[PDB]
Every structure is written in structure tokens, then in C-alpha cells.
Amino acid sequence: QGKIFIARRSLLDELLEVDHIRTIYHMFIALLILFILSTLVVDYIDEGRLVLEFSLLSYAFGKFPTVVWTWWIMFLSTFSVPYFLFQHWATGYSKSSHPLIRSLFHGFLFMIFQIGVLGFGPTYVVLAYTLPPASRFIIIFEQIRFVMKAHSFVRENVPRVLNSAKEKSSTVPIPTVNQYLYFLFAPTLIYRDSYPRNPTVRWGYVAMKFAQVFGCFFYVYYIFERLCAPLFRNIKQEPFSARVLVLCVFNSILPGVLILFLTFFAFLHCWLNAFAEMLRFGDRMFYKDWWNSTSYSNYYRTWNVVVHDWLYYYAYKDFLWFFSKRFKSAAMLAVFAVSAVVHEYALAVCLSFFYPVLFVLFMFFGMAFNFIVNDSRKKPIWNVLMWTSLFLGNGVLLCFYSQEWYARQ
Amino acid sequence: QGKIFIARRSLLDELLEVDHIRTIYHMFIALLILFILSTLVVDYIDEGRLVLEFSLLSYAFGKFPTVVWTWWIMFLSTFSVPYFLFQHWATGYSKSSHPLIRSLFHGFLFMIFQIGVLGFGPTYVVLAYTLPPASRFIIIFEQIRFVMKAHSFVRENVPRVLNSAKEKSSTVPIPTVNQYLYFLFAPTLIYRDSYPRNPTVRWGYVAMKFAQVFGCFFYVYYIFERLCAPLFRNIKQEPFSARVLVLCVFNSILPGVLILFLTFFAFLHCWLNAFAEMLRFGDRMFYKDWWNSTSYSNYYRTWNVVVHDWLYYYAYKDFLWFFSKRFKSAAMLAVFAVSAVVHEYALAVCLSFFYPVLFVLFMFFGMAFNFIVNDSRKKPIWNVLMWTSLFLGNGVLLCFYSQEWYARQ
Amino acid sequence: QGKIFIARRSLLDELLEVDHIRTIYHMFIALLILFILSTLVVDYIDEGRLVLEFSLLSYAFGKFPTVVWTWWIMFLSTFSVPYFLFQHWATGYSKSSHPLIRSLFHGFLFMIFQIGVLGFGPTYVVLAYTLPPASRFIIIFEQIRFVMKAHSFVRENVPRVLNSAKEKSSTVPIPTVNQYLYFLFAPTLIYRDSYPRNPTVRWGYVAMKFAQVFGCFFYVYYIFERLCAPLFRNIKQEPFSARVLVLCVFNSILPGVLILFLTFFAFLHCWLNAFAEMLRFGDRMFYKDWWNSTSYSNYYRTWNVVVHDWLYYYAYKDFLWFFSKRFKSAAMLAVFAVSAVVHEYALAVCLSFFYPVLFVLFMFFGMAFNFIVNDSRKKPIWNVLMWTSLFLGNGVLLCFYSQEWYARQ
Amino acid sequence: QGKIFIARRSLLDELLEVDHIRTIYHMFIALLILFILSTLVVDYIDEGRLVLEFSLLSYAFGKFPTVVWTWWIMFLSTFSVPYFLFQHWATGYSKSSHPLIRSLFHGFLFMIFQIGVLGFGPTYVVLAYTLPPASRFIIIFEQIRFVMKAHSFVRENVPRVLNSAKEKSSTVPIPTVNQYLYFLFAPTLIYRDSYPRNPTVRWGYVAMKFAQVFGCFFYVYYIFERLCAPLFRNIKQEPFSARVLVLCVFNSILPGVLILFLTFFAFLHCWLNAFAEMLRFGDRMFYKDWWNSTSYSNYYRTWNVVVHDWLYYYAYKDFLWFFSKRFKSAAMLAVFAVSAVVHEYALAVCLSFFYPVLFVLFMFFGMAFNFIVNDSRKKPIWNVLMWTSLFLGNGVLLCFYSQEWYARQ
Numbered sequence A, B, C, D: 001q002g003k004i005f006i007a008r009r010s011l012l013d014e015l016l017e018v019d020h021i022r023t024i025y026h027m028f029i030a031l032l033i034l035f036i037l038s039t040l041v042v043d044y045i046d047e048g049r050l051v052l053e054f055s056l057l058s059y060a061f062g063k064f065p066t067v068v069w070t071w072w073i074m075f076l077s078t079f080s081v082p083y084f085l086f087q088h089w090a091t092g093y094s095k096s097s098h099p100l101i102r103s104l105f106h107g108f109l110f111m112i113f114q115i116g117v118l119g120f121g122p123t124y125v126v127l128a129y130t131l132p133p134a135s136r137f138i139i140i141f142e143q144i145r146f147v148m149k150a151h152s153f154v155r156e157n158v159p160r161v162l163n164s165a166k167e168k169s170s171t172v173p174i175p176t177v178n179q180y181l182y183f184l185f186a187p188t189l190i191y192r193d194s195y196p197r198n199p200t201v202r203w204g205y206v207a208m209k210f211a212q213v214f215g216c217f218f219y220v221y222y223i224f225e226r227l228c229a230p231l232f233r234n235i236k237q238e239p240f241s242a243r244v245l246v247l248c249v250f251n252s253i254l255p256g257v258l259i260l261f262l263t264f265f266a267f268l269h270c271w272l273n274a275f276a277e278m279l280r281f282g283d284r285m286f287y288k289d290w291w292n293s294t295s296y297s298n299y300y301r302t303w304n305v306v307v308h309d310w311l312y313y314y315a316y317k318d319f320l321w322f323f324s325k326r327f328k329s330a331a332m333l334a335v336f337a338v339s340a341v342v343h344e345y346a347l348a349v350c351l352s353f354f355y356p357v358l359f360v361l362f363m364f365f366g367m368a369f370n371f372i373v374n375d376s377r378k379k380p381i382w383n384v385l386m387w388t389s390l391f392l393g394n395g396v397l398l399c400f401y402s403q404e405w406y407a408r409q
């Protein structure tokens, strides 16, 4: 039982040298160049000399030093406190000084840490110090990382000591500082001990990926500056829903499709592969072929495997363990709820306004796209119906939120 | 020396079942559905119940009886006259009734046919009897077809009779009229006798291809409303060239790439393979792998093979035969001159206005791109600069021609 | 039992080179020239320089785009639906998924196709969308063709599958779609597989036949002006039935015999042999020697063989199979009823007026002539009474229908 | 030299049992019946009871007894006088009582007989006794017969005695009364002695032919009564040549074609075969296949052979003998002149009015159709051009003459 790690290459890495997929890479590079050329020409003819600095990224990433030290103190807390609270179980169940009291005491001491440090601290600085929207996503992303890393650490290592406590006069297994610190930078949220590793670090591989991530970040910026600038920055007259909403949703698809592809490739594939090569890591199978998946049969699992496995093993299966067996119902509702609640919250903090049609779109449809679709469907038309729904869902998302953001200015 | 036919499949047809490119097929199907849904919703809320007749295709495909009018007279003339004039060499050089004068007499009669009946006839019809754009294109496209088919027939069969005439008292080779007629519907412009043929015909294949061509034609129509209509039909105020032109070119790039991909797949693969399957034809190498091609060194010989072969074998090589040896300049400029004038002729007749920037764009840059890039460079950066040049070239093409067409009213 | 095809030539084609019947060909050619010369001289002295457009054919062959409109939808439907419904018996009786109900279900679907798409469809088109006479006749003629072709396809191939179904675990015979399509253009309404075929095609033959059919169509047009126009177009005064009717019938006999001979030669021989040569078809016994035939005993089976065979094999013999044995009365009246109603239907739709004297003339006399004359009489006096009956019958037909058509305005 | 007689059957007699030409016989019988039925019905509804006697034939054949005795006295004169004048040469050149005087004396006695009896006598009775037009043709026809029979008798038998006169003490050959009287009823105008004869008279053959001649005569009457009655008996108003003349010529073709066929079959073939069988006669090759002849190459010779041979041997060849050799000019003009002069005269006597466009049509065109056509032409198109010219020539003839006849009443 549990996830088992096998030394594999990433799917898209081996699939980017077929000599037909490398074309699409070059097409997107060519479109990056043509975006840059267009923006530089337009900005040159509008003003005097060409724009030196971008000016959006200065506002978007505003008070950066306060993001650096709040990340540092969050990193120091999640490194020190969970490890020290678990190292307090060095005695643990060996002497057994009245069990049932100390177990739930240290359990409550873990919970007050989880809420007190990561619940308030990250939210307090972003809300109180009036940080800008793009810069706030970094703190919230890293918050959701470290709360997962801490709970994963506690949930996996407790079974070791709790099983080993039955054996009398035996050496208790406790994780060391080195391998836990290694896990806290690793690109997977499952085990603590002896990950499958590669022989040597290339260092040219990590350089090319970090260059692609940089190129992707600029692409995402230029997407919002040309695809989402002209029609959201400008509009303010005859505030009616007669036809303009359908066209605003329609014209926001083509930006949304590229944003979805860039946010995948930049972060999920390219950024994690770079850290998986820089720091020795062998699995690299953290996404799968969702491209030809039946709608939401594999798409749920195959999109992010690292965060899916987190939810599958420690939220879904632990819920099923707590209720023993036989539901396939409110357990499925609870894992969809917590996933939607984490998203709506993360988005709500950054723009400081609420209006989550996102939750209704994740709650109503996220159920609909699993219960009335099934996994056994094999017809290719269902891939079309997935890709229709994904296109429209993301287009409606980007439209309504960027409308709402510029509406409050 | 001449082209040698081998029983192959179209590379995309072979490659479309690899399970990653069938995604891209479903991506474009899904975008068609979302384009149809968007247009039907907008039309419903705008006017009445829903769109009954499309309104654009009614104007564009206007006087269609006077196109069938044209095509059938054009088909009967190009079937009857070229073969009958060549079959009149049955006596040929065998009798030798004072040769050299009768040969040039029949050559003159064939030239008078080519210019008077196909060069002047259908172009007089479309200009004299007023026809709308997209309807004229059928007449001029099918005109250029039958001019090539007629020239291909005579030029290949003259060497047979002349070589057979060298050795006197022999059975003069004249192709039977089932052959040539088969060629007149076959999807290649090269040989007469014994093409490679498949053993059976599927007919489910051709039904799927004509279904796709029917879907592509609509896709292309949907392109003109939801993708181009707003920015061309509407704009009529403040006639200045300050920032609007660069924006209009940039906004017209993204429809452009889709038009280029749809006109490629629909005609060159799907429609042409449908005829290549319905009729028994075995070669089906109408286009090579031009996706992963070096920039402009080989794009010309891998984009459209059937037209390239016609040019390379009958215009280029015949010019090199006439000038004997060693130019690679007069021949290069001659074939470019023949192709670019015919393209300008094709696109100048339909809209009845001239503005041949398309000619100078193909002449000036198309030379450079052949000569500065070379076939010796193998680095992938050139492929990026091909896609950059093709995206910009097509975006400038569609923008400027539409700007000019809509400006004449 | 069924018809057995043997490689023959058309009897007239064989007989046209006997050197005395080639005179009669030249007699009718010479009369065409003298009809053209007479009409051109009259038109010159009457109005202006000469007749530019014929004026009758402009009205008669009126809205011809909405006929191609019809024919192509009708051709695609009768090609696709009948074969696909029959091909759906690929599973057939081999699987035996509860037979007797699915067989009648597909039989019902085929009946709904036959009535709704061909019985009601084209007749609705010609009546709803107003069309002139001689243009409607094309739609209803080609309608009746595809109804017979569709019925002939199913009725011949059902015995194959049922006899093959008796012996289980065998390769179910289903005709390939090159066959049937070949049949759908072949000039006979009987078999599917392996017709007798000639070794080569002449193409000078078909050019001569289409030249003759083109000449015959005009001959028939020339008939309506110089032969009928004066006595139908003009007469409008003193509405009495005193002597004018007998004179009008007598004057309409001599055009009648020419119309009967031209409609025979042009369509049944010349046009049908042109298709029988252009396409490879070997039988060509579309009509026997009905010239020297006993009066009405065998005229029916020697006049038009392709329609007679369809009736005799699929209407007459199937009715005798259904009623088992011994009637020669119910079957005779049934086939007469089917033919006379279809003829009246064909001639009632085109002029939109009814007056079915043609039905009672075929019913009352056509019975008598079959029964009183018999196949046993061999005296030449009966042949005289056939030609007397046919001359009078056609003269009364043309007179009364034209009288009625010209009277409705 | 001279015509040589061979025992042959008539061409159309053996050709009327092919089983395809017998059809045309039955078609013309069927049209005879339908003509009779139409006329009897029309005459019944117009008047009281149906017409008992025809009434036209009573006027047409009026004073018949005076035609009988003038024929009798003409027959007695042409039998008695030429034979007695030639029997006066029983001495002839035997005693030779001053030759050169008696030869030209008896030659002048023959000429005064020829002119005095047959020139005046026949013309005198028809002009003086005011006989009707149809009845006059009998006297003129029989006049032209007996003048030919008499000149043929003299011209052929003179060479016998004139050659035999050189031999001394030899029996002179003189024709007997029996064989000359036999010749005077025979259906050929060439020899006097030992015609090729058949074994036995059938008597059923002559009965069938005389029945056909009677049926043909009635057909010719009904042709003039229905085809030439309604439009020539009636018309008298707005006497202008604007368009009516072209239509009157056009509508008179179809009568003219049947008149030409009936006057051939009735008289030439059927009437002569009847007398050729009744009275023993073996040649019967007095017409040939003119149906497929090149225009006026064989038509001149092949139409009537009996009257052609008369002109060829005794007018044309005797003229060529008198001028020795080498003309092919005024001899050809003279034989065309005498032939045209005999026709125009015969037609002029019966209607008593002159107006011969017939002579201009025989003189101008009869030359044109021999000198500029030639005999060596072999293309089938020339048969069409003959049959066009024959149709128009006879149609113009019947129109203009029957117009002129009713114009003078």
C-alpha cells in the first residue's frame, strides 16, 4: 500500500524530441518573439523612446523584501516546529508516561501551530501591509506548500512509531534533520526516507529549464498586457449585459487557453524538473497524459499527481479509513469541498474581494463532471466534450475575475 | 529522371493515429463547437429565434448556376480539344507529311486553345458577368487546374512520339482516352499510364473526409464572423495610420494561422485524399513533413508537392534544358515569376481590385529566404524564424487585403 | 429463372448499316435541315435579323438550377440510404438477434425512405417551388428511376442473405459499393454483380450518339413550333365541338408519329447506348424488333425492355409468387394498374392539371388489345391494326393534352 | 453495244420481304385507313348521310368516252402507220430504185405522221373539247408513250436493213406484226425481237399489284382532298407575300413527299410489274437503288431506267454519234432541254395555263445538280443534300402549281 517510487523520466521531456512536438515548442517561441516585437513597436510609436522597464511588474511585484522575510520566518517555523514536536516523541511510547493524554496534547500543539503560524501569519502580512495582487500569490502558494509538507511529515511518520511501540526493547525510528530538510525542497509530498535518485547532476539541464521558466513568465506577462489589457483596462461605458458579456467571455478564451498551457509547462513540468535535476530526484512522474483522457476520468489524477496523491492518500483514503469502508459519496464531496475551499480562499486573499463563482463552478460542475460521466467511457467524442468544457470554464473564469478586479478601481 | 510513384500514405493520415495528434484534431473540433455555440447565442439574443441562413455564404457563394455554367464548358473543352489535337499526330511523324511546319501548326493551335479558351474565356466570364468573391475563386482555381493538366498531357507524350518516330515503321504510342480522363480527375499533375493503385476502396474513408471538408469549410466561415467581422465590417472613422495598423495586423495574426492550417488540411490533405481514395490512387504524397523543416530551404518542395512537382519538372527543368547548363538564377527567378504572377492573377480577378503587395512580398523576401537561409543549416533556431516569418507574412496578407476590400464601399 | 445477360448489340445499331435504313436516317436529317431553314427564314422576315435565343426552351427549361438542386440531393440520398440500410444486415440473420421484428423494422425504414424522400420529396419540390413543364419531367423521370433502382437492389439481394442464413457460420454475401454505384449509372434495372462487359471503349461512338441526342432534342423542339404552334397557340374563338376536333386530331397525327419515333430513338436507343458505351456494358438489348410485331401481343415486351423486365420480374412474378399459382387476371390488371397510375402521375405533376384520359385509354383499350389479339395470330393484317391504333392513340393523346394545357390561360 | 437484257426480278419486289421494309408498307396502309376514317367522319358530321360517290373524281375524270376513242384512234394510227411505212421497205434497198430520194421521202413521211397525228390530234381534243385537268394527263401520257414506241421501232430496225443491204442476194430482216404488237404493250422501249421471258404467268401476282395500284390511286386522291384541299380551296384574302408563301411551301412538303412516293410505287414499280407478269417479260429492272445515291450521280439513271435508256441510247448517244465524239456539253444541254421541254409541255396542256417555273427549276438546277456535283463523290452527307433538294424542289412545285390552278377560278 501507499505510493511506490520508480526511477522514471518525465513524459513531456522524452516526448519533446519526437520531431513533431518540438515544432509546437518552436511555434510558441515564434509567437513569443512576435508578441515582443508587436509590444515594443506599439510602445515606441505611442511614447518617445522604447520602454526600458516593463512598469507592470514593478506594481505587480511591489514590496518584495517583506515577501522575502515573511517567507524566511515561515520556512524557519515549518522546519523547526514540526520536527522539534516530533523529536519530543523520542521518548514517545517507550516509557509511556500515561498515553492518550500526551498524544492528543502534542496533537493539539501541532494544530495550534498549523493554524496560529500558517493561518494568520501569511494572511496577516498580505492583508495588513497592503501588498499587490501578483506578489500575494507567492506567500499563499508557499503557505499551502509548507502546511502540506508538515501534515505529510506527521501523518506518515506516526504509523512507524505507533507500530514499533508494540515491540518491547527496540530502537525507535526517528527521521534525521538532513533527510527531512531534503524532503522540504523535494518536488513530491509522500515519503521521508530513501527516494529513488539519479547518478549525477547535469547542470546544463537545469540551466535550460530555468531559462524556459523565465521565458514562460515573460510570455504570461505579455499575455495579460496584450490579450487582457486592451478590453479590460479601457471599458467603462453603457454598463449593460446585452451581448457584450458573451463576446467578453468569447474573446477571453484564447488568452485563457495559453494561460492554462503556460501555467502547466512553466510551473508544473519545467520548474519541478529543474529542482528534480538540481537536487537529486528520480521519480519525475508528477503529471500524466491528460491530453487524450476521457473527461475527468483521468484528468483529475493526471493533471497534478503530486497534489492529487496528497489528496488521495491523506484526505480521501484517511477519510475512508476514519469511516472504515463503503461510501463513495460524502467522502468524495469532502475532498472536492476542501479542494475548492483551498482554491477560492487563495484567490480571495490576493485580490481582497470575494465573489467566488469559482466555488460554484468547482462545486456544481466538478461533481457533474465525475458522477454522471464515469471512468469506463471509451468513445473519442468525450475528449472533445472535455476540451469544450475546459476551454469554456477557464474562459469564463479569466473573464469574470479580471472584470471584477478592474471594476473595483 | 522524372517522378517515380510509390504506394504510400499521406504522412498526416499515418501520423493522425499516434494518440497525441488526435488530441489536436479534438482540440480544433472542440473549438468549432464553441465557435458555433458562441455565434448561435449572440444571434439569438441580437435579432430573433436563431440564424436560419448564414447570410455571408448567401452573398459569397452568390450566382452559383453561372459557375456550373463555366466549369462544365471548361471541363468539356479541356477534355475534348487537348486530346483531339494530340491524337491528330496519329499520322504524326510516321507518314512525315513535311514535318516541322505541321508540328508548329498544331503547337500554335494548342497555344490558341490555351490562351483563348482557358486564359481569356473564364476570366472574361467572371469580369463581364458580375460575380461575388469566393465564387470567382472556384472558376479561376479550376481554370489553372485544367491549364496545368493540358500542358502536362502534351509535354509528357511528345517525347514518346518523337523517340518512336526516330525508329521508322513502328506502332505509334498514343494514350487511350480512359487514361488522361482518369488523370483529369486524379490528384497529381505528372504521368498518364499505370499509376500505382490500391487493391480496394473503403468508401467509409471518403465519407469521413468529405464530412471533415464540410466541417472545415464551415470552420473557415465561422472564422470570418467571430474572428474578423468586428474589426473589418465596423471600422470607418478617423482615417489615420497612428497605432491602428500595427494593432490590426497583430489582431489579424491569430485568425491568419487558423486560416492557413484549415486551408492546408481541408483542401491539400482531406479533400485531395478523399478523391485519392474514392478514385483508386496509391501515391498520396501530396505534402511531406514540412512542419519540422529548415526555414525556406525546403518549405517550397514539402508544402504542396503536386504543384511543386509540376513547376520543378515542367517549368524549372525545361528552362534549364532550354538554356542547357549552369545558371541557378534565371531559372530561380523565372519559376518565382511564373508562380507569383499566377497567384496575383488569381487574387486580383476575384475582388476586381489590384494592389499587388502579395507579389512584392513573395518576390523580395521569398528570394532572400531561399538564398540567405540555405539547405545546409540544420539548427532549430531557423525553424523559429520560419514560423515567425509565416505568422507575420500571413497576418500582414489577410489584414491588408481585407482593409482594401472593405475600403471599396 | 431470372434474366440472363448475353453480349449483344442494339438491333437498330446492327440494322442501321444495312444501306437502306441509313437512307431513313438521312431522310430525317434532311427534314431537320429543311425545318431549321424554314423557321430561320420565317423568323428573319417576321421580326429582325434572326432568332438569337429560341424563346420556347427558355420558358420550358426554366428554373434549371432548382433541378440540379433536386437531382443531386436525390442522387446522394438514393446512393447512401438504400445501401446503408441493407449493409446494416451485416450482422443480419448470422447473429440472429431476435429475427422477424428487426427485419420488418428495416423494411419499414426502407418504406419510409421510399415514400417520404422519393415519393413525397421531389413532387413537393416541383409543386411548392413553381417550375415550368419539360423541367419538372426531369425531376419526376429521375425520381422514378431511383425508386426502381432502390427496389431492384433490395429485392435481388434479400434472397442471397436469407439462403446464406439457412446454412449457419458462413461469409454473408453483401455487394461492395463500386457495384450498385456502377448499377446506379448502368442502363438496366436487374442485377448487381458481374454484368457482361465489352473489352474496350470507343469514345468516338459516344460522341456520335450525344451529337444525335443533341440533334433529336432540337428536332423535337422544331416539332413544337412549325408543326404544332400554329394550331394550339392561336385558336381562341367560337368555342364549339363542330368539326374542329376531328380536324385537330387528324392534323395532330402527323406530328405525333414523329414525336413517338424521336422520343424512341433519342432516349431509348441513342442516349441509352451512349451511356452503355461510355460506361462498359455489354448487353444493349434495350428494345427488340417491335416493328414487325403482332398487334399488342408482344408490343409491351419488345418496345422498352429495361422497364418491362423490371415489371415482369419484380411486380408480375412477385404477385404470382404471393398468390402462388393460377390467376392471369389479378396479375395482369395489377401490373397495368401500377404502370398506368405511374404514367398518369408522371404527366399530371408536370402540367399541374389532371384530366386523366390517358389512364382510361391505357386501361380500357390496353386490356382489350392484350386479350382479343393474342400471341397466336401471325397474319400481317394485325400489324396494320397496331399502326392504326398507335397513330390514332398518340394523335388523340397529343391533341387533347395540348388543348387542355393551352386552355388554362 | 446497246442495252442487254438479263432475266432479273425487280429490286423492291425481293426487298419487300426482308421483314423490315414490309413494316413501311403496313404503316402506309394504316395511314390510308386513318385517312379514309377521318374523311368519312368529317363528311358525315358536315352533311346528312355519308358521301356515296367521291364527287371530285367525277369532275376530274369527266368526259371519259372521248378519251377512250381518241386513245383507240391514236393506238390504231401508231400501230398501223409506222409498221406499214417500214413494211414499204420490204423492197427497200434490194432493188435500190434511186436511193437517197426514197430514204428521205419515207423519212419525211414518218415525220409528217409523227407531228400530224400525235402533235395535233391529242392536243386538239383536250384543248377543243374542254376536257378536265386530271383526264387530260392520260391522253398526253399515252401520246408520249406511242411517239417513243414509234421512234424506237424506226431507229433500231433501220440499222438491220442498212447493214444487210450491203450483202447481195440475201433475205432482208423485217419484223412481224405479232412481236411488234407485243412490244407495243411491253414495259420497255429498247428492242423488238426475243425479249427474255419467264416460264409461266402467276395470275395471283398481277391481281395483288392491280389491287395495290387501285389502293395507291385512292391514296393519291385522299392526299389532294385532305392535304391539298383545306389550304388551297379556301384561301382568298389579304393577297400579300409576307410570310404566307414560306408556310404554304413548307406545309406543302409533307403532301409532296407522299405524292412522290405514291407516283413512283403506283405507276413505275407496281403497274409495270403487273403488265410484266401478265404479259410475259423477264427483265423488270426498270428502277434501281436511288435511295442512297449521291445527289444526281445515279438518281438521273436509277429513277426511271426505261425512259432514261430511251434518252441515253436514242437522244444522247445519237446526238454524240451525229457530232462524232468529244463534247460532254451542248449534247448534255440538249438532252436536259428536250426532257424539260417534254415535261413543261405535258403540264401546260392539262391545266391550259403556262407559268413554268418548272422549266427554270429543271434548266438552272438540273444543270447545277450534275456539273458542280460530279459522280465520283462518296461522302454520305451528299445523300442528305440530295434529299433536302428533292424535298424542297417537289414542295415548291406542288405549292406554286396548285396555287396557280385555284388562282384562275
Ligand SMILES: CC(C)(COP(=O)(O)OP(=O)(O)OC[C@H]1O[C@@H](n2cnc3c(N)ncnc32)[C@H](O)[C@@H]1OP(=O)(O)O)[C@@H](O)C(=O)NCCC(=O)NCCS
Pocket: B300, B301, B308, B311, B312, B316, B332, B335, B336, B339, B340, B362, B366, B375
Ligand atoms: C524552384 C523551387 C522548386 C525551389 O526548389 P528546387 O528547384 O527544387 O531547388 P534545386 O533542386 O534546383 O537545388 C538543388 C540543390 O539544393 C541542395 N539540396 C539539398 N538537399 C537536396 C535534395 N534532397 N534534393 C535536391 N537538392 C538538394 C543541393 O545543394 C542541391 O545541389 P545540386 O544542384 O547538386 O542538386 C521552388 O522555389 C518552386 O518552384 N516554387 C515555390 C515558389 C513559390 O511558389 N512561392 C510562393 C510564395 S511562398
Ligand SMILES: CC(C)(COP(=O)(O)OP(=O)(O)OC[C@H]1O[C@@H](n2cnc3c(N)ncnc32)[C@H](O)[C@@H]1OP(=O)(O)O)[C@@H](O)C(=O)NCCC(=O)NCCS
Pocket: C300, C301, C308, C311, C312, C316, C332, C335, C336, C339, C340, C362, C366, C375
Ligand atoms: C405484364 C406484361 C409484361 C405482359 O406480358 P407478359 O407478362 O410477359 O405475358 P406472360 O409471359 O405472362 O404470358 C405467357 C403466355 O404468353 C404466350 N407466349 C407466346 N410466346 C411467348 C414467349 N416468347 N414468352 C412467354 N410467353 C409467350 C404463351 O401462351 C405463354 O403461356 P405460358 O403461361 O405457358 O408461359 C406487360 O403488360 C407489362 O408489364 N407492362 C406493359 C403495360 C403498360 O405499361 N402499358 C402502357 C400503355 S401501352
Ligand SMILES: CC(C)c1cccc(C(C)C)c1NC(=O)NCC1(c2ccc(N(C)C)cc2)CCCC1
Pocket: B263, B264, B267, B268, B299, B300, B303, B304, B305, B307, B308, B339, B343, B344, B346, B347
Ligand atoms: C501557401 C502558399 C503561399 C505556397 C507556399 C509554398 C509553395 C506553394 C506552391 C506553389 C508549391 C504555395 N502555393 C500553394 O500551395 N497554392 C495552392 C492553394 C492556394 C492557396 C492560396 C492561394 N491564393 C489565394 C493566392 C491560391 C492557391 C493551397 C491551398 C488551396 C490551393
Ligand SMILES: CC(C)c1cccc(C(C)C)c1NC(=O)NCC1(c2ccc(N(C)C)cc2)CCCC1
Pocket: C263, C264, C267, C268, C299, C300, C303, C304, C305, C307, C308, C339, C343, C344, C346, C347
Ligand atoms: C410508349 C409507352 C406508351 C409504352 C408502351 C409499351 C410499353 C411501355 C413500358 C412501360 C414497358 C411504354 N412506356 C415507356 O416506354 N416509358 C418510358 C419513356 C416514357 C414515355 C412517355 C412518358 N409519358 C409522358 C407518360 C413517360 C416515359 C419512353 C420514352 C422516354 C421514357
Ligand SMILES: CC(C)CCC[C@@H](C)[C@H]1CC[C@H]2[C@@H]3CC=C4C[C@@H](O)CC[C@]4(C)[C@H]3CC[C@]12C
Pocket: A019, A020, A021, A023, A024, B021, B024, B025, B028, B029, B032, B212, B215, B216, B219, B261, B262, B265, B291, B292
Ligand atoms: C475538424 C476541423 C476543425 C479541421 C481541423 C484540422 C486539423 C486536424 C489540422 C489543422 C492543422 C493541423 C496541424 C498543423 C500543424 C501541426 C504541427 C505538427 O508538428 C504536428 C501536427 C499538427 C498539430 C497538425 C495536426 C492536424 C491539424 C491540427
Ligand SMILES: CC(C)CCC[C@@H](C)[C@H]1CC[C@H]2[C@@H]3CC=C4C[C@@H](O)CC[C@]4(C)[C@H]3CC[C@]12C
Pocket: A021, A024, A025, A028, A029, A032, A212, A215, A216, A219, A261, A262, A265, A291, B019, B020, B021, B023, B024
Ligand atoms: C515560452 C515558451 C517556450 C513556452 C511554451 C510552452 C510549450 C513548450 C508547451 C505549452 C503547452 C504544451 C502542449 C500542451 C498540449 C499538447 C497536446 C499533446 O497531444 C502533444 C503535446 C502538446 C502540443 C504540448 C507540448 C508543449 C507545449 C506546446
Ligand SMILES: CC(C)CCC[C@@H](C)[C@H]1CC[C@H]2[C@@H]3CC=C4C[C@@H](O)CC[C@]4(C)[C@H]3CC[C@]12C
Pocket: C019, C020, C021, C023, C024, D021, D024, D025, D028, D029, D032, D212, D215, D216, D219, D261, D262, D265, D291
Ligand atoms: C396504298 C399503299 C399500299 C401504297 C404504299 C406504297 C409503299 C409500299 C411505298 C411508298 C414509298 C416506298 C419507300 C420509298 C423509300 C424507301 C427507302 C428505302 O431505303 C427502303 C424502302 C422504302 C421504305 C420504300 C418501301 C415501299 C414504300 C413505303
Ligand SMILES: CC(C)CCC[C@@H](C)[C@H]1CC[C@H]2[C@@H]3CC=C4C[C@@H](O)CC[C@]4(C)[C@H]3CC[C@]12C
Pocket: C021, C024, C025, C028, C029, C032, C212, C215, C216, C219, C261, C262, C265, C291, C292, D019, D020, D021, D023, D024
Ligand atoms: C437524326 C435525327 C433527325 C433523329 C432521327 C432518328 C431516326 C434515325 C429514327 C427515328 C425512327 C426510326 C425508325 C422507326 C421505324 C422503322 C421501321 C423499321 O421497319 C425500319 C427502321 C425504321 C425506319 C427506323 C429507323 C431509324 C429511325 C428513322
